[PDB]
Amino acid sequence: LTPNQVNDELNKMQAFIRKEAEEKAKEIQLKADQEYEIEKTNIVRNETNNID
Amino acid sequence: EFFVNYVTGVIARDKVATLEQILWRVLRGNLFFKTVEIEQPVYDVKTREYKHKNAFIVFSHGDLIIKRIRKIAESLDANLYDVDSSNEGRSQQLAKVNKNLSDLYTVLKTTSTTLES
Amino acid sequence: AYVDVFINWFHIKALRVYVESVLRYGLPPHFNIKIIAVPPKNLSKCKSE
Amino acid sequence: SQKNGIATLLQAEKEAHEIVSKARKYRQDKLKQAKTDAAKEIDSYKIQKDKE
């Protein structure tokens, strides 16, 4: 019946699903890399303390 | 025939176009509207008539907006219908409905003879 | 205060339509858009065409 | 209408599951990477200080 909504429904659907997944990817990357950094900071102090 | 937000409910046979235009508006030029008239019209109690009723099927990305959808529908006319977007659960629904279906019709004939005698 | 609120008074509706069109129609990013600037007394006149 | 769901919502479900699994595996394996690299760093510092 209506062609343009047929056309753009999944276009917009996937575009915004991927925008949401991009926010998700940046969030997971940020938090996991922060985990990496803080974890290295945690371990280095522990080892240095022990062996000092 | 179809096409986590799909809704289903009873829509007045006559007022179908009113709903279609209200949708035309509320969803702002984006809709997937599929409805068919219901043969064998049905009864009611609000007006207590053998009314003429239809049903609706629509999909769209609104998740919280469905609040307004169901609210307006019921305030006008609607019967909640938890449905499935495929025909697999169709079998489950057939089974569950047939459960009561097998016996429903007794009530009347049972009630008859007692009051008669 | 008047001159300050001038710009935003219509920036708001600019963005309103900016988004209403996209969600209404067509591909996400952008479309042709313009502002109408005409003398008065022809409102229904223009609105017809 | 007839079976547009069969395609569109099947794709939507598969994409949703895939993106959520992608985020889960990314955060998981990034955490494991942080833990393993932390183990390597602590071992390197431990052997350094033991040599000292």
UniProtKB/Swiss-Prot annotation, chain A:
* Similarity comment: family membership: Belongs to the V-ATPase E subunit family.
Q: Which species does the entry assign this protein to?
A: Saccharomyces cerevisiae (strain ATCC 204508 / S288c) (Baker's yeast)
Q: What does this protein do?
A: Subunit of the V1 complex of vacuolar(H+)-ATPase (V-ATPase), a multisubunit enzyme composed of a peripheral complex (V1) that hydrolyzes ATP and a membrane integral complex (V0) that translocates protons. V-ATPase is responsible for acidifying and maintaining the pH of intracellular compartments.
Q: Give the region (Interaction with VMA5) as residue ranges.
A: 1-13
Miscellaneous information on this protein: Present with 16134 molecules/cell in log phase SD medium.
The name under which this protein is listed is: V-type proton ATPase subunit E
Q: Which residues of the full protein are shown?
A: 8 to 59 of 233
- TM ranges are none
As for subcellular location, the record says: Vacuole membrane
Coiled-coil regions in this chain?
8-38
Region span, Interaction with VMA10: 12-31
Top-level taxon: Eukaryota
Q: What binding partners and quaternary form does the record give?
A: Homodimer. V-ATPase is a heteromultimeric enzyme composed of a peripheral catalytic V1 complex (components A to H) attached to an integral membrane V0 proton pore complex (components: a, c, c', c'', d, e, f and VOA1). Interacts with VMA5; the interaction is direct. Interacts with VMA10; the interaction is direct. Interacts with RAV1 and RAV2 components of the RAVE complex, which are essential for the stability and assembly of V-ATPase.
Curated annotation (Swiss-Prot), chain B:
In which domain of life is the source organism classified? Eukaryota
Of which family is this protein a member? Answer: Belongs to the V-ATPase 116 kDa subunit family.
**What other facts are recorded?**
Present with 55714 molecules/cell in log phase SD medium.
UniProt modification remark: Glycosylated.
The molecule here is called V-type proton ATPase subunit a, vacuolar isoform
Subunit description: V-ATPase is a heteromultimeric enzyme composed of a peripheral catalytic V1 complex (components A to H) attached to an integral membrane V0 proton pore complex (components: a, c, c', c'', d, e, f and VOA1).
Functional description taken from the UniProt entry:
Subunit of the V0 complex of vacuolar(H+)-ATPase (V-ATPase), a multisubunit enzyme composed of a peripheral complex (V1) that hydrolyzes ATP and a membrane integral complex (V0) that translocates protons. V-ATPase is responsible for acidifying and maintaining the pH of intracellular compartments. Is present only in vacuolar V-ATPase complexes; enzymes containing this subunit have a 4-fold higher ratio of proton transport to ATP hydrolysis than complexes containing the Golgi/endosomal isoform and undergo reversible dissociation of V1 and V0 in response to glucose depletion.
Location in the cell:
Vacuole membrane
Full-protein interval shown? 150 to 297 of 840
Curated annotation (Swiss-Prot), chain C:
Localization recorded for this chain is: Vacuole membrane
This molecule's function is given as:
Subunit of the V1 complex of vacuolar(H+)-ATPase (V-ATPase), a multisubunit enzyme composed of a peripheral complex (V1) that hydrolyzes ATP and a membrane integral complex (V0) that translocates protons. V-ATPase is responsible for acidifying and maintaining the pH of intracellular compartments. Subunit C is necessary for the assembly of the catalytic sector of the enzyme and is likely to have a specific function in its catalytic activity. Reversibly leaves the enzyme after glucose depletion, causing the catalytic subcomplex V1 to detach from the V0 section.
Family statement: Belongs to the V-ATPase C subunit family.
Question: Which protein is depicted?
Answer: V-type proton ATPase subunit C
The record's subunit annotation is:
V-ATPase is a heteromultimeric enzyme composed of a peripheral catalytic V1 complex (components A to H) attached to an integral membrane V0 proton pore complex (components: a, c, c', c'', d, e, f and VOA1). Interacts directly with VMA4.
| Misc note | Present with 21114 molecules/cell in log phase SD medium.
